[PDB]
Design a protein around this ligand. Structure first.
Ligand SMILES: Nc1ncnc2c1ncn2[C@@H]1O[C@H](COP(=O)(O)OP(=O)(O)OP(=O)(O)O)[C@@H](O)[C@H]1O
Ligand SMILES: [Mg+2]
Ligand SMILES: [Mg+2]
Length: 371
């Protein structure tokens, strides 16, 4: 019970008050494992992560090419959670983001100081963000090896350190818009991803196809719940995770989105490159400045963890300072800088929501092409 000032999501606050136990209570599910991998031919390894080794394969009945994610040992409820989130997201008959926009059902946090963060622009159209969520096809467990495994849609993906340097300005705008649609959708479904980063964004460039994968750290948003802060990876951790503000929400994904975006635009990878947990916060404050950092700690009456007391005073780095001739083709306009500036804010309440980000001027050339 850490938090002094309490916080609620600006938007989609009450999804899991609307939805019941059978939707969000993953701990009280029983996983219906398939006894056999007999339906699948498992081929070669195509990727890995902290929690898995992932193999390409074929679903033999249909000949559809798939991937199989072999899960490393973890608490069993983490497995139930990933499965529940993936099935909630794929099984929704009418994705809320396909329905006509309802402002009063969107801006649900009615605190006067939170309402001031409503932007003058917003993408208010129905969209297909649900189609950017990876699809789970099966759950399997080998009887002999006892390895839990998740069968997904295959995406023909190239490592971001190869692909991203090739992308044009317009292509970055396109893909990042696709990512925002996926986030708007999972947020509308009362779910925070909490591990938004390039390795978790599959892109098939020739098919202009984007999928948001890796739902193993995702969690249901419940109003005033205090969550574990030891999630995501160091480089993408929002300030709330570092200062141990546990009452966070969907806006954590928008900090991650912003840090991913800042890396692509300024070609500094990763953008906040901490050499330790402690130094991760230092790298952030070196950029956003000490002054706003202290205003933020004051706003929520946060007592800084002990490790951060050796931090020096930093003057804010204007974003302009990240522009150079190597990156100016991506960074050399006011729109991208204002976008980044409005995502990468200490105060999570201040950050653009996915829908607000989608209506930002920087995405005009993408929005223009929708109709
Ligand atoms: N559907 C897919 N199509 C193609 N490649 C995939 C797919 N799913 C996963 N991969 C590859 O496997 C890697 C690991 O998968 P995933 O991110 O789901 O596992 P993880 O172990 O939970 O990762 P993290 O360390 O970010 O938590 C991915 O980064 C990706 O390169
Ligand atoms: Mg991953
Ligand atoms: Mg949002």
């Amino acid at each position: 019970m850490k938090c002094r000032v309490w916080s609620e999501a600006r938007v989609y606050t009450n999804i899991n008050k609307q939805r019941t136990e059978e939707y969000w209570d993953y701990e009280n599910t029983v996983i219906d494992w398939s006894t056999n991998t007999k339906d699948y031919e498992i081929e070669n390894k195509v990727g890995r992560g902290k929690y898995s080794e992932v193999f390409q394969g074929v679903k033999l009945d249909s000949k559809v090419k798939i991937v199989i994610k072999m899960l490393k040992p973890v608490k069993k409820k983490k497995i139930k959670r990933e499965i529940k989130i993936l099935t909630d997201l794929s099984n929704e008959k009418v994705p809320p983001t396909t329905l006509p926009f309802q402002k009063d059902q969107y801006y649900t946090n009615q605190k006067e100081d939170v309402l001031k963060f409503i932007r003058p622009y917003i993408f208010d159209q129905p969209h297909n963000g649900h189609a950017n969520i990876i699809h789970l096809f099966d759950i399997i467990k080998d009887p002999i090896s006892k390895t839990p495994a998740l069968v997904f849609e295959y995406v023909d993906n190239v490592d971001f350190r190869i692909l991203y340097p090739k992308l044009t300005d317009l292509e970055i705008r396109f893909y990042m818009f696709e990512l925002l649609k996926a986030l708007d959708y999972c947020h509308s479904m009362g779910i925070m991803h909490r591990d938004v980063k390039p390795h978790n964004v599959m892109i098939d460039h020739k098919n202009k196809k984007l999928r948001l994968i890796d739902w193993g750290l995702a969690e249901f948003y419940h109003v005033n719940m205090e969550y574990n802060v030891r999630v995501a990876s160091r480089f993408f951790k929002g300030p709330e995770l570092l200062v141990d503000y546990r009452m966070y929400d969907y806006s954590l994904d928008l900090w991650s989105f912003g840090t991913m975006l800042a890396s692509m635009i300024f070609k500094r990878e990763p953008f906040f490159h901490g050499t330790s947990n402690t130094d991760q916060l230092v790298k952030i404050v070196k950029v956003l400045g000490t002054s706003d950092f202290e205003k933020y700690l004051l706003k929520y009456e946060i007592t800084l963890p002990r490790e951060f007391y050796d931090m020096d005073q930093y003057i804010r780095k204007p974003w302009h300072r990240f522009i150079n001739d190597g990156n100016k083709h991506l960074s050399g306009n006011d729109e991208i800088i204002d976008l980044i500036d409005n995502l990468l804010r200490y105060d999570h309440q201040e950050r653009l929501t996915a829908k607000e980000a989608m209506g930002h001027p920087w995405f005009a050339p993408i929005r223009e092409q929708i109709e």
